[PDB]
Design a binder for this molecule. Sequence first.
Ligand SMILES: Nc1nc2c(ncn2[C@@H]2O[C@H](COP(=O)(O)OP(=O)(O)OP(O)(O)=S)[C@@H](O)[C@H]2O)c(=O)[nH]1
Ligand SMILES: [Mg+2]
Lengths: 319, 193
Amino acid sequence: RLVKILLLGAGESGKSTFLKQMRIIHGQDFDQRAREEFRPTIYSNVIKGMRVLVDAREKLHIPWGDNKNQLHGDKLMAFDTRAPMAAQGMVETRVFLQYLPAIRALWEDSGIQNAYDRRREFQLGESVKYFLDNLDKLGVPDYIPSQQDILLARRPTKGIHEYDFEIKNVPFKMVDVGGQRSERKRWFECFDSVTSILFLVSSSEFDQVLMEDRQTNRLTESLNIFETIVNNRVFSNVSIILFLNKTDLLEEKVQVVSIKDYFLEFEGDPHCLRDVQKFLVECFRGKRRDPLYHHFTTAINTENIRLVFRDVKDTILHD
Amino acid sequence: LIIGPEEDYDPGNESDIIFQDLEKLKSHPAYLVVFLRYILSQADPGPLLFYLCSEVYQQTNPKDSRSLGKDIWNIFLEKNAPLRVKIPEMLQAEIDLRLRNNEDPRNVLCEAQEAVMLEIQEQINDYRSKRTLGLGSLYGENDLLGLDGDPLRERQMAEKQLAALGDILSKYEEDRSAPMDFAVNTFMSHAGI
Ligand SMILES: Nc1nc2c(ncn2[C@@H]2O[C@H](COP(=O)(O)OP(=O)(O)OP(O)(O)=S)[C@@H](O)[C@H]2O)c(=O)[nH]1
Ligand SMILES: [Mg+2]
């Protein structure tokens, strides 16, 4: 009777963000207290993210916009990311405020900006840019993360997590799991009584490599995982739905990067969003060895997810 | 290099070596069943099953192998075989000719096994990529996360994973599950499981 939905996908595909949306759209949402619990994670995202940027600036030999910022760069690299709290991906407010001036100056530096634009050469999520562009509101003494901030807050998932909700007298149980390699060993425990699998893919990852081994192409990894799930006879009765997520990022990326440089078989306009999306869908459809439900989503956009899940629900409830 | 933003990540050897060579994979029943589980769920079971049954025929006295050879033919080579396997036209013709005239089919059967080995090695490489994806547990690898270098202990585990295979064979229609079961048992029983 319960509709059990399993969220699968490689690391950083948006699974946990989608899960937060279900709570926002069909659950109790996030009140002020629940949102304040994300503040330490947000401050950690910013400090660790900026540290990645200065390290990248130095190692990629990118000139400083102003070398007086070297003093700020030193202060940030000196922040110990291995200490107890930082290790848990948390930063106290008083600590954050001590680094705010240095972080603000660094973000305005053209060398740091150049490093960010070349992030494909290392590992860094775009949500870091979102928070760096909102340092003014994060810096206020009584900052309380907004719903949008909570959706962008980043933390890699470990273990299995469930969230239950109801839609018009219909009970749902959604399962979230970690997508990075070492966490996939937990997937086998989540398929009991599964009604549907929502397979998430970061549509904007075609020019990136894995965090696990900075060599394998991220899109290639997603295709290979999808291939093993969709062709497993054990899931013959389970409906699989593909989400080409981060559509918003893909729209902005196709204007500065050509997918053709990473996937030769692409034959269309690299600067055209629809041409690339069609290519991505073809790639996944081709992994199935004899109906591919799919949606272009933006997990951080509540309105987009509200309407996408409406279609997903109808699809699942009719299979 | 450039530091990462989530250094707390934990990535979490003998196994690899075993899974890459059918030769030593066949000598490790517990490992073979994991591969069998992979094949039955993700690919064409024909190649591996034909190979294993043929292995038994090759190791059986010509005086007790008549019926087995007939079963292999009807199951994997016959025109309308349930688990038909692809092999060179020359070999299939030669095998049929020697079986119909009661000659020694071992040499040509061996050549058919080598032909199928191409496909089997491909499936082996595919599974190795799944292990790289960190998805080995989906095919029962946890059952090997405790085995010691001991034959009896392994063949012991073999018959427990082997019993649990029914869940995958049930996803098949009688016209295929029946012959597959017969194939598995023929090898396992000869392996001492
Ligand atoms: N711009 C944009 N950001 C997104 C979208 N979906 C998720 N994100 C952001 O991507 C980052 C990673 O997403 P997250 O939800 O943690 O992925 P995950 O699949 O759960 O990752 P893991 O647990 O397997 S490692 C987060 O900062 C999140 O806010 C999207 O559609 N557009
Ligand atoms: Mg997650």
